[PDB]
Amino acid sequence: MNTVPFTSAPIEVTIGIDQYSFNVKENQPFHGIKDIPIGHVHVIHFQHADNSSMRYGYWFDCRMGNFYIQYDPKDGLYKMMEERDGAKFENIVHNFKERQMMVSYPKIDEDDTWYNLTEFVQMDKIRKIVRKDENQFSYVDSSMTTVQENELSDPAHSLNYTVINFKSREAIRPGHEMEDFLDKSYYLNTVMLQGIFKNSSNYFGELQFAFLNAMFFGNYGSSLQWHAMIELICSSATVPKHMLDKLDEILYYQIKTLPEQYSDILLNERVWNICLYSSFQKNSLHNTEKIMENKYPELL
Amino acid sequence: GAMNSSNYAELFNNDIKLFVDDTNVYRVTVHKTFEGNVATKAINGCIFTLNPKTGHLFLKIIHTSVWAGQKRLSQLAKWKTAEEVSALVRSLPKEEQPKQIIVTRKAMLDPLEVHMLDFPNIAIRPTELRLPFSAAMSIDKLSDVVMKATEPQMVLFNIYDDWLDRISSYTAFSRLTLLLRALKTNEESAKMILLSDPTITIKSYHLWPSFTDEQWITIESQMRDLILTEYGRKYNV
Numbered sequence A: 001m002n003t004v005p006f007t008s009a010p011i012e013v014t015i016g017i018d019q020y021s022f023n024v025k026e027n028q029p030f031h032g033i034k035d036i037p038i039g040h041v042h043v044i045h046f047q048h049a050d051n052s053s054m055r056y057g058y059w060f061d062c063r064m065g066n067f068y069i070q071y072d073p074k075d076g077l078y079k080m081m082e083e084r085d086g087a088k089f090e091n092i093v094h095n096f097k098e099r100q101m102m103v104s105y106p107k108i109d110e111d112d113t114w115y116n117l118t119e120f121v122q123m124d125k126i127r128k129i130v131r132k133d134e135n136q137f138s139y140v141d142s143s144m145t146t147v148q149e150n151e152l153s154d155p156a157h158s159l160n161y162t163v164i165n166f167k168s169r170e171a172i173r174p175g176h177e178m179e180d181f182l183d184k185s186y187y188l189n190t191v192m193l194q195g196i197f198k199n200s201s202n203y204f205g206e207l208q209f210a211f212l213n214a215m216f217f218g219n220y221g222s223s224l225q226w227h228a229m230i231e232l233i234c235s236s237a238t239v240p241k242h243m244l245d246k247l248d249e250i251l252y253y254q255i256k257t258l259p260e261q262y263s264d265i266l267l268n269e270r271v272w273n274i275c276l277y278s279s280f281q282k283n284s285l286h287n288t289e290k291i292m293e294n295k296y297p298e299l300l
Numbered sequence B: 001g002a003m004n005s006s007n008y009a010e011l012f013n014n015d016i017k018l019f020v021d022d023t024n025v026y027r028v029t030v031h032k033t034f035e036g037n038v039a040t041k042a043i044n045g046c047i048f049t050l051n052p053k054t055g056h057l058f059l060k061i062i063h064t065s066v067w068a069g070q071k072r073l074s075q076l077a078k079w080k081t082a083e084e085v086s087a088l089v090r091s092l093p094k095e096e097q098p099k100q101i102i103v104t105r106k107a108m109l110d111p112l113e114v115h116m117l118d119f120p121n122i123a124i125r126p127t128e129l130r131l132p133f134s135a136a137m138s139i140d141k142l143s144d145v146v147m148k149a150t151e152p153q154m155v156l157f158n159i160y161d162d163w164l165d166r167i168s169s170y171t172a173f174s175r176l177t178l179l180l181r182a183l184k185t186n187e188e189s190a191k192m193i194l195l196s197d198p199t200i201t202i203k204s205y206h207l208w209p210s211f212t213d214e215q216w217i218t219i220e221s222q223m224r225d226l227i228l229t230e231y232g233r234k235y236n237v
């Protein structure tokens, strides 16, 4: 178990860690988060009490270093930093742990939700989507746009997701125009899986990361990307049987974790109705279809 | 964006553009099988690709052999149309290629878009107008050449005959759409009006009769009357 400590909390803020969250009052004696499960990526995120604009946060993996947060009063936000003095951090962490100034990452033992939402997400792939190589951790916020959104403005602050575009030369073989547009298997299996992602695990990692950025930051481009990655699979007649089964598990836990009051903005009617009820894989997503129907039958 | 009454004069400016109509590409007569089931038999069709400024018509004849052993023909027809329009553009010299293609039915947008990926600067536009180009097979010489075809074939016409010697493109298009609207609403009556008196002929190199300017006014009036009529006879007004 690892710990992400705080110098202090000078402004009132709602702090999230993965799917959990708690409210911290202005100058309350908060000094961090302990008992963080090792073995998964994590995301700590923030919504200031005074400006609910800009949800922002940091993707990190406690295996890659000791990370701590100090409020920056010039830039006006909680920043993640990487301590290089391992004994300073441990003396500091222990000191705070003895004063019980930390919240405990509140994982129920039965609960596999976080694992299931981050199964294929690796820090190394996050750091290629979010380019800032001087830090081991990755900043994301509500307003950041994607490479693809930019093509249709600051490149240093972009989400470099894999561009998917169903009416593009990459997607459509000269001479198979109709074949490839109505059955995207070529583009899924040859272009993306074999060519770009190399394996389905990396494809699923990006899909899961896009969902989590949509959910935790309301990042519109990330939601576009999540839906595009689902639609490419559902609109392919030929999908490895193992991918279909795992996709069902993936989406199941994403829909299960979504706030009930956000389905209006984060869920795209056309994609889900096509994916669950018309596409090649309309019958291959029983668990996802089941929870979509018992939980959001309005959208459909 | 979509083409409508507001931007109607853009059709006759000096940017090359084509209308593409796919109504008559996949044509079937529906009949009964000996077992009393229903079957379709295809007949020859055509793509109606028209330059509204110049009248040049690229009539790609679609021979029934193109459907042999194919499934979901109505969907195939849209993709075949888009394949053939893309091939026509690639066949034209660069300075003759269109800057826009306007499809008469919105279901042609994605098919044509995907076939024209090599031409990112050719705009594919739908239209809000309800153009009567389906009636092109009511023009006797076009119907004749389609039905006689024994192989795929492109036939070139000027759908305005020699009208542009005397009238503008705007006026020629209006006359064309009036004639075709009339043939579409009551083909029998329309053809009676056109092929009326025995001193009016169709030149061998033309599609329509050789009306004087005054006779065209009379003809056009008669066609308007027919269109409103049928609109009464239909609606009872």
Ligand SMILES: COC(=O)CN(C)C(=O)c1cccc(O)c1
Pocket: A005, A006, A007, A068, A069, A070, A083, A088, A089, A092
């Ligand atoms: C409290 O006054 C200090 O000088 C020390 N603080 C809390 C830090 O900067 C700090 C906090 C957490 C971890 C770390 O590695 C350092």
